Scaffold this active site. Structure first.
Site, PDB file in Angstrom:
ATOM      1  N   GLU A 130       0.866  -1.087   0.052  1.00 14.21           N
ATOM      2  CA  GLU A 130       0.055  -0.047   0.109  1.00 14.21           C
ATOM      3  C   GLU A 130       0.857   1.212   0.126  1.00 14.21           C
ATOM      4  O   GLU A 130       1.086   1.897   1.099  1.00 14.21           O
ATOM      5  CB  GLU A 130      -0.940   0.039   1.162  1.00 14.21           C
ATOM      6  CG  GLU A 130      -2.323   0.680   1.045  1.00 14.21           C
ATOM      7  CD  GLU A 130      -3.306  -0.307   1.302  1.00 14.21           C
ATOM      8  OE1 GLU A 130      -4.472   0.350   1.364  1.00 14.21           O
ATOM      9  OE2 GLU A 130      -3.114  -1.302   1.785  1.00 14.21           O
ATOM     10  N   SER A 144     -28.717 -32.691  48.393  1.00  8.41           N
ATOM     11  CA  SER A 144     -28.107 -33.688  49.091  1.00  8.41           C
ATOM     12  C   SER A 144     -26.740 -33.389  49.483  1.00  8.41           C
ATOM     13  O   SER A 144     -25.885 -34.155  49.815  1.00  8.41           O
ATOM     14  CB  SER A 144     -28.262 -34.971  48.402  1.00  8.41           C
ATOM     15  OG  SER A 144     -27.389 -35.919  49.267  1.00  8.41           O
TER      16      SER A 144
END
Length: 672
Positions: free
Chosen positions: A147, A388
């Site tokens: 670029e 439990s």
């Protein structure tokens, strides 16, 4: 007025400034010669500290693997003890342990080799504005090679202002002269659109470095900069995890595009072109570890206070264990679909919390069947009924009275009716034909009627005092005969603190996740120290933690004692009425793990406590190498043997049970 209008609009978006983010690290591992860790156990530790396994290491953060050793280049770190740089260590193994940590640079030796912690995430309040001088020198040159922005002014306006050929074209002409060419790219590299995740936009090289590789942009390898630059024309086309064959031919393309203007020779190209995608092979996240990071931000707000808003450049040190967190998520996401299909369930969830046995540091957390989601944390907000799982606190109060209650006290097993009229029935509806069961066969088999007959004899003002010592809040304890069987609502982060007082031997350590917070200049803003307060006697938390090894070997959880019989697990299985919730609190040599499995709409699940949270647990153990539980008897605990009728005998006996007594000649009185 066009020229004046656009100029004022440019400065509007450009302004909005910046600060540095805070880094959140994990726990610190300290390698030592002759330590119990294998080679395959060591590669799964390095790969969890974000160490790229390459075939030729040249840059800090890469480790190669050899015949029977591991070479690595430890990346520099500023430890709270001292500041250190690169180290080229060769960890030679000896089978099941670590032999030497020879330093490759001069063939020296190492006393103990420190490992840098992993980066969990970066937090700023994403701001993540790395300045123009904070980007690598080969990054701008790699963006320019693909670029040429000696081209870059128009590209900026497309990302910034747009998601109109006249506006953006005129925009670029006035942005070129008004701003310097070094102020241009600083705004570009911090705003490029590099990917999409869900509905959030991945913008900028800083935030895309963490998303794709999980490391700061200043540490990108030259084959990782080419992937991140090659994906500027990508954005959900050229990204991995979808097409990890197309991102690869774009990675190699940028390399041979940037080797034209010679900065890479043919030897370096063939080297880098062969390395696979360095992306984190799990799926990048914008905000990683959301379940654990709720516990940290809560811990940061309380431990620091009003300074939590000025976290800029500070390093935050947590107790997050990365190997245990990978095994906690691997069991939830792969176990829940295996439970849903077998029972034809519409939905099902889970939660897992792992704390250290002796210190209480939180090592893992899972908020649901998709731990990488965000919004609901069932390990800190889902208040369910333990069921439990509340018997270990009834028998821990009996056993804390060693003059009258031992492991062979006979408990009545007859039909009972109380006044809350209430008449409990055993979890299998069966009754003992002899009319009585010992205090060890009551907890091993998890019987419902004896637990009430034992809990009512102690009185609820005493079973409540035990729950407070263990560390449950006073407001959740409502004393009624149903509390004894688990009419108690607790989140997995309060059950893990309750079973940590039993697992350590009575030393209640408050659960924590902050280790230390070091400022950016070197000042220490917070340094955590252990509390480890004594709650229950060490001889009563051993007789309970012994019985919890029978409820794993021959009790209600025997299905674990048939798979891992060498670890000697201790664990209580939790069930509820019609299986609204199912838990399993298990203990091994190092950590306490709490598992929950239930439906969010509070409806029955068809899963039994030995097939719900227990099957998720025996996956969590398989995804790692646990440490065996070796109970060392405290002082005054003496093994004594009983005969058929449950009486103490001088020698022999058909059963051996520990007994908290300072004069083991109690059998002389009970034999006669």
């Amino acid at each position: 007025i066009y020229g004046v209008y656009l100029d004022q609009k440019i400065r509007s978006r450009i302004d909005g400034k910046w600060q540095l983010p805070a880094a959140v690290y994990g726990r610190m591992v300290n390698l030592e010669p002759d330590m119990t860790i294998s080679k395959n156990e060591m590669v799964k530790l390095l790969e969890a500290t974000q160490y790229r396994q390459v075939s030729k290491m040249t840059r800090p953060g890469e480790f190669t693997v050899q015949a029977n050793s591991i070479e690595m280049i430890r990346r520099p770190f500023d430890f709270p003890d001292s500041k250190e740089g690169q180290v080229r260590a060769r960890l030679t193994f000896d089978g099941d342990h670590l032999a030497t940590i020879v330093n490759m640079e001069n063939n020296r030796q190492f006393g103990f080799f420190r490992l840098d912690p992993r980066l969990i995430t970066m937090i700023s309040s994403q701001r993540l504005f790395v300045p123009r001088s904070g980007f690598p020198d080969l990054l701008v040159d790699t963006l320019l090679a693909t670029e040429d922005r000696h081209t870059l002014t128009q590209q900026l306006v497309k990302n910034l202002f747009l998601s109109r050929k006249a506006n953006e074209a005129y925009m670029a002409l006035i942005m070129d002269a008004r701003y310097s060419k070094d102020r241009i790219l600083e705004l570009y590299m911090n705003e490029v659109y590099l990917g999409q995740s869900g509905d959030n936009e991945i913008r900028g090289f800083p935030l895309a470095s963490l998303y794709y590789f999980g490391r700061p942009v200043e540490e990108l390898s030259l084959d990782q900069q080419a992937l991140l630059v090659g994906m500027v024309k990508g954005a959900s086309i050229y990204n991995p995890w979808r097409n990890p064959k197309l991102a690869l031919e774009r990675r190699n393309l940028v390399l041979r595009l940037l080797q034209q203007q010679q900065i890479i020779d043919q030897e370096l190209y063939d080297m880098l072109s062969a390395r696979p995608l360095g992306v984190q092979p799990r799926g990048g996240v914008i905000s990683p570890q959301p379940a654990f990071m709720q516990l940290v931000r809560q811990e940061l707000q309380a431990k620091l206070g009003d300074k939590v808003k000025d976290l800029s450049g500070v390093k935050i040190f947590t107790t997050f264990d990365s190997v245990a967190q990978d095994a906690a998520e691997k069991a939830a996401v792969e176990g829940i679909p295996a439970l849903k299909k077998q029972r034809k369930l519409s939905d099902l969830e889970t939660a897992i919390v792992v704390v250290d046995r002796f210190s209480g540091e939180v090592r893992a957390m899972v908020g649901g069947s998709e731990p990488q989601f965000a919004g609901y944390n069932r390990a800190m907000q889902a208040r369910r009924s333990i069921g439990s799982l509340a018997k270990p606190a009834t028998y821990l109060t009996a056993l804390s009275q060693p003059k009258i209650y031992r492991l062979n006290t006979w408990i009545a097993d007859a039909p009972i009716a109380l006044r809350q009229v209430w008449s409990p029935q055993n979890d299998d509806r069966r009754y003992s034909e002899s009319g009585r069961v010992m205090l060890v066969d009551a907890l091993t088999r998890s019987m419902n009627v004896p637990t009430v007959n034992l809990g009512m004899a102690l009185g609820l003002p005493a079973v409540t005092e035990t729950w407070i010592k263990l560390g449950v809040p006073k407001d959740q304890l409502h004393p009624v005969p149903a509390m004894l069987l688990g009419a108690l609502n607790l989140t997995p982060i309060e059950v893990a603190q309750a079973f940590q007082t039993i697992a350590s031997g009575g030393n209640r350590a408050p659960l924590s996740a902050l280790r230390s917070v070091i400022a950016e200049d070197g000042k220490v803003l917070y340094q955590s120290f252990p509390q480890a307060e004594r709650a229950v006697p060490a001889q009563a938390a051993y007789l309970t933690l012994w019985t919890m090894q029978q409820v794993v070997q021959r009790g209600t959880g025997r299905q674990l004692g048939a798979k891992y019989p060498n670890l000697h697990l201790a664990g209580k299985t939790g069930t509820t009425n019609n299986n609204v919730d199912t838990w399993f609190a298990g203990i091994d040599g190092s950590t306490v793990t709490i598992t929950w499995v239930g439906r969010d709409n509070n409806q029955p699940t068809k899963l039994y406590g030995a097939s719900g949270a227990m099957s998720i647990y025996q996956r969590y153990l398989a995804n790692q190498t646990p440490t065996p539980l070796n109970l060392v008897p405290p002082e005054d605990i003496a093994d004594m043997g009983v005969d058929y009728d449950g009486n103490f005998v001088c020698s022999g006996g058909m059963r051996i049970l520990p007994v908290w007594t300072s004069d083991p000649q109690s059998l002389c009185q009970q034999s006669e």
